[PDB]
Amino acid sequence: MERYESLFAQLKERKEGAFVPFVTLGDPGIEQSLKIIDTLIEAGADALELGIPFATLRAFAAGVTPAQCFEMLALIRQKHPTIPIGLLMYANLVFNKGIDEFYAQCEKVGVDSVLVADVPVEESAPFRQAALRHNVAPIFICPPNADDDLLRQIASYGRGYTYLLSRAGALPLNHLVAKLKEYNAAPPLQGFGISAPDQVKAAIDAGAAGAISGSAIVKIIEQHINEPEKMLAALKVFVQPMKAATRS
């Protein structure tokens, strides 16, 4: 079963767009991160975009280990079987534990897609192969100044959805979505600098299938770091308008 494809079909039937929040796995802590994610979903998130972070002092080797992240991912999958889960990270972590072993670990956990930020589409063969091999969808970024060549590649390689970078990352988003559709690329989601409901709305009118937001959610997390109860309430208040802006 392909989550994204299934999700997108349900949205298109309701003339609705997708709101995809982003949050780093483990912020502020494992316990909290899981509760902020439940809330994000409870508030209206159609899919999750999860960031994976990566002997002396207990403040140097801090952070959440890769193992803990996949453990969280598994728990999230268990409680929310249908929601598309895509990861965002750098090649580093994938190399550390082997490419095929990392994508296998994702297939085991249930992530639907992976986006390796620091890897050109030109040298992504080993990543695509390992992803396709484990039913994971390889995701590629599409810059607003991409030439026809790159568009044909990302369209033929990617699955699930394609990441449409904002001009603020250059042609109008309206023009890009058309080329992607012509080449039969996966649905596009805009993702840079969208922190307002009016910005989400514009993305969808321009033809995008959905929008992704990160910073706006992070700020709320750190502005209530020592107020968990109030933090979750502030997240809901922020997501409602964003998701609402995706409706017709």
Swiss-Prot record:
It catalyses: (1S,2R)-1-C-(indol-3-yl)glycerol 3-phosphate + L-serine = D-glyceraldehyde 3-phosphate + L-tryptophan + H2O. Pfam families: Trp_syntA. Its EC number is 4.2.1.20. It is an enzyme of class 4 (lyase). Keywords: Amino-acid biosynthesis, Aromatic amino acid biosynthesis, Lyase, Tryptophan biosynthesis. PROSITE patterns: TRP_SYNTHASE_ALPHA (PS00167). Pathway: Amino-acid biosynthesis; L-tryptophan biosynthesis; L-tryptophan from chorismate: step 5/5. CDD domains: Tryptophan_synthase_alpha. GO terms for cellular component: cytoplasm; cytosol. GO terms for molecular function: lyase activity; molecular adaptor activity; tryptophan synthase activity. The active site is at residue 49. GO terms for biological process: aromatic amino acid family biosynthetic process; L-tryptophan biosynthetic process. The alpha subunit is responsible for the aldol cleavage of indoleglycerol phosphate to indole and glyceraldehyde 3-phosphate. Tetramer of two alpha and two beta chains. NCBIfam families: trpA. Belongs to the TrpA family. This is Tryptophan synthase alpha chain. It comes from Escherichia coli (strain K12).
